[PDB]
Amino acid sequence: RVKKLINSQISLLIGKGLHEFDSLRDPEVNDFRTKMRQFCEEAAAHRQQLGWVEWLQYSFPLQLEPNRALLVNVKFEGSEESFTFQVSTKDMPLALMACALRKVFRQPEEYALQVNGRHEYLYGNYPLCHFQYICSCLHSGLTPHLTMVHSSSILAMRDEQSNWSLEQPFSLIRKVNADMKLVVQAGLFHGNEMLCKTVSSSEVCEPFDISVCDLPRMARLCFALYADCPIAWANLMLFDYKDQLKTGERCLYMWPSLNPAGTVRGNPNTESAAALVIYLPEVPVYFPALEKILELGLYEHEKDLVWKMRHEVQEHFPEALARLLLVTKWNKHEDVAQMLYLLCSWPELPVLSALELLDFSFPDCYVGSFAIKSLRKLTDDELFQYLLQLVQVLKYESYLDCELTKFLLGRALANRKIGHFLFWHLRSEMHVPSVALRFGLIMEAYCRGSTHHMKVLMKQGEALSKLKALNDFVKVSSQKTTKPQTKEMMHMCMRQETYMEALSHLQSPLDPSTLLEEVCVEQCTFMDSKMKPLWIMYSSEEAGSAGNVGIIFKNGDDLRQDMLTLQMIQLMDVLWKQEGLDLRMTPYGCLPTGDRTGLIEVVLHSDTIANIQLNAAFNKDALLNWLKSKNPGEALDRAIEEFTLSCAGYCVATYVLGIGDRHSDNIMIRESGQLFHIDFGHFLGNRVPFILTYDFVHVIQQGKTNNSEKFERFRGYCERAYTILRRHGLLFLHLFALMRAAGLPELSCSKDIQYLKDSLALGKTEEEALKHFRVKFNEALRESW
């Protein structure tokens, strides 16, 4: 009786009824559901038994940065009284907890410090400066506000959150766009490479050189209906999920336009799609087992020598695995068995090398499982960093039950932050028919393993439902009345009991540690841009100035490129900080949540260069005079430096990623001096050269006409930042390679990925690449008036 309600909620949450899965009567979809539910309920079981410090690690993972005086305000749970302490930046949380315990009435290890009005906590053997909240409070100049939450209070949160040897050569039987003759071109693929010659049909509008023993485990039959005028395409795995070779006829529901990367599952639109009927022949015959395979196991000459020293490749150079995998003959079963035998004794590879193995160039199930075993060593911070890519790779998968789905679902049920973003990446693509079944099932399994978080996500989904309804009203009204009239009409709609409830008391889909408490309707409005986005302000009494946070709701545009660009800039910032370089970056949150729908984090105390220049004796002084008002006296020098660093950081970021169409309207400055970029519509030269605006150069130069001292410090930052990224060049190339799965119009072919190779100058020597950058930087200076 209670299971009916839970299933009803899952259906509403995932944006797909659970009845649709059962109606398919597909054994693959049924076996995934039954197996994955047990795996998820086991995770929920192990979670309700975890200790209070272990639960805190699940629900509120620590936000850490990749001696000095500090005034901290410590509070207690269920008390209005607060006390200010003189603690060091080197001091641990346990020492600060001892001070609060010492502080007036009549063990510190039984407590955890909560960040006021936020789902963030301060615990563990880490100095105060290492935590992202205390670190940010130092730079902002704001006093950190903490709460002494006892073990009994944390434990009560866990309790409230309760739950085959045949040499026979391999070998067509509606709703087609008429004109011309229709021909079916077919090929046998194993990832990118072809197993044999692409045999096509006979050339009027409703109408292989490989042995069966040689066909690999992960082989695909790729069809295409031509007229040259393309009509449709269709893919199929020759072996099923149960490991047996496909026998008999099959009706293939074609996708509208050989495409190897495309899905192996059929078109859901059975009514309005072209169907191709194929005759797959009688041989039961299942693929040989691991025991049977192990019992059997660059230029043309360069690849021949790599295959000869295959045994030496395992011992001498184990990181060369990928080069050997692209040289192995997948069209010859004897060669596959010898390679697979080497893969079983192959030692575990580092995270960087495993990220490469997850590409479409390595479609083998065993080679795939090797990459997951090597990716198990990823930290929850590293896994979150590459989460977008690992979700896109699920589109390359052949079967519903895969090692990547197990790993992502296993880590998501072990970390609430990881499970939060895995939910949104899956939910935001339920409009796309090719992934809607897979993504739907993965989200259902997660819900079976997290009934409390399911209701937490339901509240987020309800807020976003009211936001679309309010935005459509804004869209219609903006084309009919004056802005103040529309804004008041929006406020009235928001002030409704249905809206006030849904829009208040929730977790930010952008940051689960950010609590969207009370909605500040009076301060809410909409942006003048084409899609009329919504400016939604919030406030929390318990958090004070920390709860004064905002969100931007935008419907009508694809937010995937922006999310990807910002994440890359955030990876740039992390790698820079790792080499001691803090370029004061502002990687604001950007998370798509639906069909051309998403959320963008509000950077408070910021304005656009355009609004600052439009209002000083000279226009060149505007940007600087603004920083003089927002930073008077001694504070200006710190702000010119914050500007200088962020300008250097954003100059390299836009150059390396090839972001163009940068103007005064899509560049912002924070009152701290921190410059940042918004609206990343175009990237990877869709060649964008280095850019130096004289308006920013005037600020770097402290107002002076010829300040070589300050300007050249800035050249140094750009150079340092560029050389740091160059070292991790492969990280960006490997991540962008996996992102080809997403189907982003500016990231589809090899030419887009080649842009990153040219911008980072991967081939050239560090000395030679620094000079090439020095020529482009100087050309950017000459370009400034």
Ligand X SMILES: COc1ncc(-c2ccc3ncnc(-c4cccc(C(=O)N5CCN(C(C)=O)CC5)c4)c3c2)cc1C#N
Listing DSSP states for 146-211 in one string gives EEEEEHHHHHHHHHHT------PBP------------EEEEEEEETTEESS--EE---------SB
Residue 489: helix, strand or coil by DSSP?
Answer: helix
**Least distance from ligand X to the Cβ atom of residue 665, Å:** 7
Cα 438 to Cα 234, 252, 391, 445, 559: the distances in Å are: 18, 18, 11, 11, 21
Dist CA 40 CA 409 (whole Å): 8
**Least distance from ligand X to the Cβ atom of residue 535, Å:** 4
**Least distance from ligand X to the Cβ atom of residue 192, Å:** 33
**Least distance from ligand X to the Cβ atom of residue 593, Å:** 13
Listing DSSP states for 652-671 in one string gives HHHHHTT-----TTSEEEET
> What x/- string results for residues 662 through 701 when contact with ligand X is judged by CB under 6 A?
----------------xx----------------------
Residues 546-585 that bind ligand X (CB under 6 A): 552, 554, 559, 562
Residues 520-549 that bind ligand X (CB under 6 A): 525, 527, 529, 533, 535
* Residue nearer to ligand X on the CB measure, 540 or 561: 561
Rg of the chain over Cα atoms, rounded to whole angstroms, equals 29
Q: Could you tell me which of 259, 276, 258 has the C-alpha nearest to residue 267?
A: 276
**Least distance from ligand X to the Cβ atom of residue 527, Å:** 4
**Least distance from ligand X to the Cβ atom of residue 489, Å:** 16
Contact segment (CB under 6 A) with ligand X among 39-47, 95-103, 600-608, 655-663 equals: 600-608
Distance of CA 215 to the CA centre of its chain: 35
Say which amino acid occupies 5: L
Residue 267 gets the label, from left (phi > 0), alpha (psi -120 to 50) or beta, of beta
Dist CA 543 CA 549 (whole Å): 10
**Least distance from ligand X to the Cβ atom of residue 680, Å:** 7
Dist CA 276 CA 232 (whole Å): 10
* Residue nearer to ligand X on the CB measure, 514 or 701: 514
Dist CA 336 CA 482 (whole Å): 70
* Residue nearer to ligand X on the CB measure, 26 or 558: 558
Which residue of 183, 603, 730, 770 would you call a contact of ligand X, by CB under 6 A? 603
* Residue nearer to ligand X on the CB measure, 30 or 608: 608
Residue 630: helix, strand or coil by DSSP?
Answer: helix
Neighbours of 384 (CB within 10 A): 19
Which residue of 9, 608, 625, 723 would you call a contact of ligand X, by CB under 6 A? 608
* Residue nearer to ligand X on the CB measure, 33 or 425: 425
State how beta strands 82-88 and 111-115 pair: unpaired
* Residue nearer to ligand X on the CB measure, 154 or 536: 536
Q: Which two tokens stand for residue 207?
A: 């109408």
**Least distance from ligand X to the Cβ atom of residue 486, Å:** 13
| Residue 236 makes contact with ligand X by CB under 6 A | no
**Least distance from ligand X to the Cβ atom of residue 487, Å:** 10
Beta strands in 671-783 (DSSP E): 675-677
* Residue nearer to ligand X on the CB measure, 171 or 615: 615
Contact segment (CB under 6 A) with ligand X among 346-354, 597-605, 625-633, 768-776 equals: 597-605
**Least distance from ligand X to the Cβ atom of residue 570, Å:** 14
* Residue nearer to ligand X on the CB measure, 516 or 559: 559
* Residue nearer to ligand X on the CB measure, 390 or 559: 559
Q: Could you tell me which of 337, 345, 421, 406 has the C-alpha nearest to residue 375?
A: 406
| Residue 600 makes contact with ligand X by CB under 6 A | yes
Which residue of 346, 384, 588, 736 would you call a contact of ligand X, by CB under 6 A? 588
Number of chain positions touching ligand X (CB under 6 A): 17
* Residue nearer to ligand X on the CB measure, 161 or 525: 525
Q: Report the interface residues with ligand X, using CB under 6 A.
A: 525, 527, 529, 533, 535, 552, 554, 559, 562, 588, 600, 602-603, 606, 608, 678-679
